[PDB]
C-alpha cells in the first residue's frame, strides 16, 4: 500500500470510423504544486498502439520500462516480430491488466488509470481501460479522472453509441478531443495548457503530435464580473 506523489491528471480518448484518438496534457503535479511541465504521458508501443497513463508518475515510468521490455522480448527468436507476430494492442492491454490486478491483489498497486488505444491487425479499433484496482472496461469514449466527468459527456455527444463510430471522421473526432482538452484546462485545477495527442488510423498509421496548446479561450467576459453580489464597481 502506498500513496501517489507526482501525478498526471486526465487521459481522454475516443474512436472514430478509421481509428482511435488519445490525448493527455504534459503536467506532473506534486500535490497543489504544478512541478513538472515536460512530462509525456502517452506511450507509443510499436506503430499500432498508444498507452495513456494518469496517476503516479514514478509508477508510469515503471510501466514504460515494462512496455519497452515487452517489445524487446517479443522480438526474441521471432522472425515475424515486425509482421504477423508483432505486438497487438490487445496483447499489450491484457498484459497490463494482468499486472494491475496482480499488484492490487498483493496490496501493492501501481497507482494509475490507463487507457490503451490502437488498431488491431484486422483493422478493428481498440480502446480499453484498466486502473489500480484491476478494473477494466470498454466504451466508444474513455477518459480518466476529471476527464471522465467533463470529457465523456462532450465526446459522447459525438459518439453516443456503437453505430455512431462509422459516421465519425478524424476531423470531427480530433476536434472534440481538442475542445475537451480546453474545457479541462478551464475547470481542472491540476491541468496544463500543453498536451500531446495521438491518432492511430488503420490507413495513415500512428500520428503522434507533441507540444499542442489550448487556444481560442474565452476570458473577456471576466471584465464584466465585479464583486460577489451587490458590489457595483
Amino acid at each position: 500500500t502506498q500513496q501517489p506523489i507526482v501525478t498526471g491528471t486526465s487521459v481522454i480518448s475516443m474512436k472514430y470510423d478509421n481509428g482511435v484518438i488519445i490525448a493527455a496534457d504534459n503536467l506532473g503535479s506534486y500535490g497543489s504544486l504544478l512541478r513538472f511541465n515536460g512530462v509525456e504521458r502517452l506511450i507509443p508501443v510499436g506503430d499500432n498502439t498508444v498507452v495513456g497513463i494518469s496517476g503516479d508518475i514514478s509508477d508510469m515510468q515503471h510501466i514504460e520500462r515494462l512496455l519497452k521490455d515487452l517489445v524487446t522480448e517479443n522480438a526474441y527468436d521471432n522472425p515475424l516480430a515486425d509482421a504477423e507476430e508483432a505486438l497487438e494492442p490487445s496483447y499489450i492491454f491484457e498484459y497490463l491488466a494482468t499486472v494491475m490486478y496482480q499488484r492490487r491483489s498483493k496490496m501493492n498497486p501501481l497507482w494509475n488509470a490507463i487507457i490503451v488505444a490502437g488498431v488491431q491487425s484486422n483493422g478493428d479499433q481498440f480502446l480499453r481501460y484498466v486502473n489500480l484496482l484491476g478494473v477494466t472496461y470498454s466504451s466508444p469514449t474513455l477518459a480518466t479522472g476529471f476527464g471522465a466527468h467533463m470529457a465523456n459527456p462532450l465526446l459522447r455527444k459525438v459518439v453516443d453509441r456503437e453505430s455512431d463510430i462509422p459516421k465519425t471522421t478524424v476531423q470531427v473526432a480530433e476536434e472534440a478531443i481538442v475542445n475537451a482538452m480546453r474545457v479541462l484546462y478551464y475547470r481542472d485545477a491540476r491541468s496544463s495548457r500543453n498536451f500531446s495527442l495521438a491518432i492511430i488510423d488503420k490507413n495513415t498509421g500512428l500520428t503522434f503530435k507533441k507540444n499542442l496548446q489550448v487556444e481560442n479561450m474565452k476570458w473577456d467576459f471576466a471584465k464584466d464580473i465585479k464583486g460577489y453580489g451587490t458590489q457595483k464597481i
Binding site: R65, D69, T72, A75, Y76, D77, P79
Partner: protein, 122 residues
Amino acid sequence: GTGYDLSNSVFSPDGRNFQVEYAVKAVENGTTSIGIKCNDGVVFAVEKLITSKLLVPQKNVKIQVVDRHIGCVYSGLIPDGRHLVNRGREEAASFKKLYKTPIPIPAFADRLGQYVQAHTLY
C-alpha cells in the same frame, strides 16, 4: 593413474580439464559459423545443413539477438547455444534495468564468459 577425464572439474596431471576438451570436440563436429568486424559494425553468418527437402527453407533460424544490439551465433550442440543466449538475455536485461543504458559488448562478453567458466568448476 587414469580416470582424470571422467569428472568435469578435475585437473589432470598436466593441468588440463579433459571434459572441457571433449566439449571442444562437440564443437568441431558442428556446423561452421563466423563473424567479421567491419568499420562500424559486425556481420554474422552461418552454415545450415539441409538434411532433406522436408526442412522448410528459411525457417529454422540459428542466429540469435540479445537485447536489441547484440548478435549471437554458435557451433556445436544447438540446445546448449540457446541456453547460453537465454542467460545472456537475462544478464542484459538486468544490466539495463539497473544502469539504464543497454549493455556494452565487452561487459556482455564477460557475463557470458563468467557463466561458461562457472560450468568448469563443478
